[PDB]
Amino acid sequence: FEIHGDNLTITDAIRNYIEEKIGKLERYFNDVPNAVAHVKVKTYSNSATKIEVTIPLKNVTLRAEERNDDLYAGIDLINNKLERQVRKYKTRINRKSR
Amino acid sequence: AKTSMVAKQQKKQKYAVREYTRCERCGRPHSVYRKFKLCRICFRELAYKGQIPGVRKASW
Amino acid sequence: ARIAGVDIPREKRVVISLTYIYGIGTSTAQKILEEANVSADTRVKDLTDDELGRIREVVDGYKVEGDLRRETNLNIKRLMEISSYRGIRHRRGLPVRGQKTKNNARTRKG
Amino acid sequence: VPKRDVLPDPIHNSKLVTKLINKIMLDGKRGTAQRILYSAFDLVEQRSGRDALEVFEEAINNIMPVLEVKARSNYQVPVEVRPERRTTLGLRWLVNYARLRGEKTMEDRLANEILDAANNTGGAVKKREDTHKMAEANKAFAH
Amino acid sequence: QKIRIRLKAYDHRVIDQSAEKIVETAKRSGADVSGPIPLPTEKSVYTIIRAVHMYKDSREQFEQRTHKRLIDIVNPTPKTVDALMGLNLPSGVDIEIKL
Amino acid sequence: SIKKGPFVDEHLMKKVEAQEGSEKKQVIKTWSRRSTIFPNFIGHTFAVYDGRKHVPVYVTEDMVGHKLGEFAPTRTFKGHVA
Amino acid sequence: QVEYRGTGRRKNSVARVRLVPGEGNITVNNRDVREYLPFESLILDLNQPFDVTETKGNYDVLVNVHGGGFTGQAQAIRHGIARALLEADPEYRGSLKRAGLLTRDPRMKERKKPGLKAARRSPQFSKR
RNA sequence: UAAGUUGGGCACUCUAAGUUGACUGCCGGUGACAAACCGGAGGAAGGUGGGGAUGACGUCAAAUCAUCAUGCCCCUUAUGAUUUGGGCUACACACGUGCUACAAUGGACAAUACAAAGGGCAGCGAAACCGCGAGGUCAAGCAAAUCCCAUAAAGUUGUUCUCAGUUCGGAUUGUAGUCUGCAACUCGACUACAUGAAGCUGGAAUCGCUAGUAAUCGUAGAUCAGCAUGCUACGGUGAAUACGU
């Protein structure tokens, strides 16, 4: 994922935080083809901390975003979304007769 | 900015070629033609004008 | 050895037999064989003593040698002696015209 | 929906050569395909010399199946083939095995294959076998 | 001894009807006129994108048209000259009076 | 390459004209991209404006696997970590 | 004598079929069909108009021709022939049209548009 | 005539503008007789013939203040403007996209057949001449249905190579040169000589395409002093599959 920051300079602190979080999804299933992160300071002028995230999946993908006061609140709030946006999928359950 | 560069491509030269044929109406240098000296987009605007003949369109 | 220099293959045509030596390509071989009026015909070393003298000597017209390796060594040695702004880019993967390193990891580097 | 017929063979007045040169016709190059195939009709009609159609028609009745399978949860059904698909797939494994001998010539691998296949041997008679071991093994739960 | 001409304008009606203007005024005071011998009338091409900053793949095309007309006349005389330079209008045509 | 053949800006050479007959100098500042070595420049020093600052290069004997336009490429360490 | 004649059109390849009573013989561009058109062993199909019309035959041939390659250029031969056979006898039109070969194939190449490159392949999407 | 070169003819093809033509139109059938649908005849073309243009209301606070313009803010001996040089291209690496190889369906070499489109004014530079070739000399013609650019490749005919990391392979680096530019070192392309890397069809995973399509081989054009594995346009060759949902 092109962890790029518009008007905010991605430190190693931020990269560590991010990747750390998505590691937790190895519960299901990782399977790590790619992942992206869009972060930006969009002045309102209360002015943001925007987070938009993208997950490419097996035979499909799931984007995810959210805004909040600061970067860490945006990464934590956008979490618990790209998990339930993922869970569930399958099973599906057998037939025919006849 | 381009404001002095307007004179740059109009100024004289030490020699033949450190020059360019930018657009007249616009100042976009790139994506221009030696036929009309117009940027990519003024041509679009004034092709819709049908100012010059001009044709336009869709017979290829 | 056999006829000339070092490491000649046996029962191989002239067309590439004269080329395994360090410094012959493919046209230069055709020239030197054209000089002794010899050609294979077809896949094989058919050579007797008859043409052996000319193929042993006409080969001497050039520095098809380790002296050509020596030529390389002494020339690059001339390069990196001086300052040298191209012996530095001699190590990056860059010839004297430039090659814009992004996917040149590579075969001139590891 | 129709299948864009080929008229006759202009060589011996058959047809399936034409259907077959086109399967050798890679890169849209016809003449080299036609070349190497008719050459194979020289080689196979030479070795144990005979007509084209003995080794050809026999061999392509030694590998050219009668039943195939298809999936549909996932239950693989044995199925009767439409004769265009039958002949189609016969020639499919014909060329697609012809390269798979791993040899040098344009034609020996071919003429070896059809000669061998007229004799009910090789991987094309084989895929007929194994295919018909998926047929009547899988009669039960999907027919 | 003959007269010849070349025409170039970018409308197919006006140019040939104008040919009928000068030809009518020509065989008025002359004759032996070659009819409107057509010519291939080639074109051009000009491609531009529907964009300003990005989106290159989504674009648009233009061209140019270029009519030529070959007309002649034989057994010349100063009357067909005045028929040449008498009535060319509309002036989108690019007459080239020659011999 | 060049059109038969080697050349000079015709001010730098006009400078070393004044430098080279007498007791030579060990100092020349310049810009020197459109000029290159040949055996009149010997025994002198040059310092070509790299793009930020000139730096000394003394003309040595067989400086022939080398030229005037550059001696320390302005990519300058490196540009790369390794 | 007499001679029939017609025109031919397909695949950017044009032919002025000149079809005369005779042995049945070809010199296209004053040059034989066979060595001229590589390879080619397909000329039964070029004589199938005789296999179906005034069968067997034969009538000798002449034709001037230019444009495109052998496929259309060998295939630009027929509709001038078969049309010249309508001009010979419209009776066989029932034997022709039930078998084609006087219907000139209206198909040809396409134009380009954004999407195409060196090989005529439209682009991929973003995987990963 | 070597040659449509000359005479002649526009007959043919060709050539650009108005014509006629395909509209379920004619018929047969199915059909609440209607709507329609299935079939058949002819016809060059039967089911909006094929494609092109045209893209509803609108979503994405989509994109662009660097096309142009501009609300507001800010600057103004500088947040403006002039010059020579650098740099925008560096690389332990990664992502995408394309290009080229991993070979006998082939590589090396000799002879030979076939297009479309389009550029040209001082630009297109014919022949001849020099040269290993890039190119250099000369100069006929020509604002083009003309003359030139420019010769098509795949292919066809043969010879050889005879399955090697090979005449595969073609990166690497050096040497010697041509063009342009005042200037080819960071940073132009190309020619001659040598050197010959990895690589034997690519793993999980993953992408496009329904017929002249895919696939493959060529051609020109712009952008231009110089310069396209890119883009646009042109053609050549040229199949497999489509049950069913």
Swiss-Prot record, chain A:
GO cellular component: cytosolic small ribosomal subunit
Entry keyword set: Cytoplasm, Translation regulation
A GO MF term: ribosomal small subunit binding
Coiled coil spans: none
Localization: Cytoplasm
Induction cue: Expressed by 2 hours growth, increases to maximal concentration by 7 hours and remains high (stationary phase) (at protein level). More protein is found in cells growing under nutrient-deficient conditions.
A GO biological-process term: negative regulation of translational elongation
Subunit record text: Interacts with 100S ribosomes during exponential growth, as 100S ribosomes decrease (after 7 hours) also found associated with 70S ribosomes.
Protein task: Required for dimerization of active 70S ribosomes into 100S ribosomes; when added to monomeric 70S ribosomes stimulates formation of 100S dimeric ribosomes. Unlike E.coli, 100S ribosomes are present during exponential growth, peak during early stationary phase and then decrease (shown for strain NBRC 3060).
Family: Belongs to the HPF/YfiA ribosome-associated protein family. Long HPF subfamily.
UniProt name for this protein: Ribosome hibernation promotion factor
Gene coding for it: hpf
Region of the whole protein represented: 4 to 101 of 190
Curated annotation (Swiss-Prot), chain B:
SUPFAM superfamilies named among the record's database cross-references: Glucocorticoid receptor-like (DNA-binding domain) (SSF57716)
Any GO MF annotation of the entry: zinc ion binding
Superkingdom, natural source: Bacteria
Co-factor binding comment: Binds 1 zinc ion per subunit.
Pfam families: Ribosomal_S14 (PF00253)
Residues the record lists as binding Zn(2+): 23, 26, 39, 42
InterPro entries associated with the record: Ribosomal_uS14, Ribosomal_uS14_bact, Ribosomal_uS14_CS, Ribosomal_uS14_sf
Keyword annotations: Metal-binding, Ribonucleoprotein, Ribosomal protein, RNA-binding, rRNA-binding, Zinc
Function: Binds 16S rRNA, required for the assembly of 30S particles and may also be responsible for determining the conformation of the 16S rRNA at the A site.
Stated family: Belongs to the universal ribosomal protein uS14 family. Zinc-binding uS14 subfamily.
The protein's name in its UniProt record: Small ribosomal subunit protein uS14B
Lineage: Bacteria, Bacillati, Bacillota, Bacilli, Bacillales
From Swiss-Prot, chain E:
Keyword hit for Lipoprotein: no
Intrachain disulfide bonds: none
Any one of the GO CC terms: ribosome
UniProt GO MF annotations: structural constituent of ribosome; tRNA binding
Protein's GO biological process: translation
A family per Pfam: Ribosomal_S10
Residues that span the membrane, as ranges: none
Keywords annotated in UniProt: Ribonucleoprotein, Ribosomal protein
PROSITE patterns for this protein: RIBOSOMAL_S10
Family under the similarity heading: Belongs to the universal ribosomal protein uS10 family.
Description of how the protein assembles with itself and partners: Part of the 30S ribosomal subunit.
Functional summary from the UniProt entry: Involved in the binding of tRNA to the ribosomes.
Protein name, UniProt field: Small ribosomal subunit protein uS10
Upper lineage: Bacteria, Bacillati, Bacillota, Bacilli, Bacillales
From Swiss-Prot, chain F:
Keyword vocabulary terms for this entry: Ribonucleoprotein, Ribosomal protein, RNA-binding, rRNA-binding
Any one of the GO BP annotations: translation
InterPro entries recorded: Ribosomal_uS19, Ribosomal_uS19_bac-type, Ribosomal_uS19_CS, Ribosomal_uS19_SF
GO cellular component, one term: small ribosomal subunit
A GO term for molecular function: rRNA binding
Function statement: Protein S19 forms a complex with S13 that binds strongly to the 16S ribosomal RNA.
Similarity comment: Belongs to the universal ribosomal protein uS19 family.
PANTHER family recorded: RIBOSOMAL PROTEIN S19P FAMILY MEMBER, SMALL RIBOSOMAL SUBUNIT PROTEIN US19M
Protein name: Small ribosomal subunit protein uS19
Annotated gene: rpsS
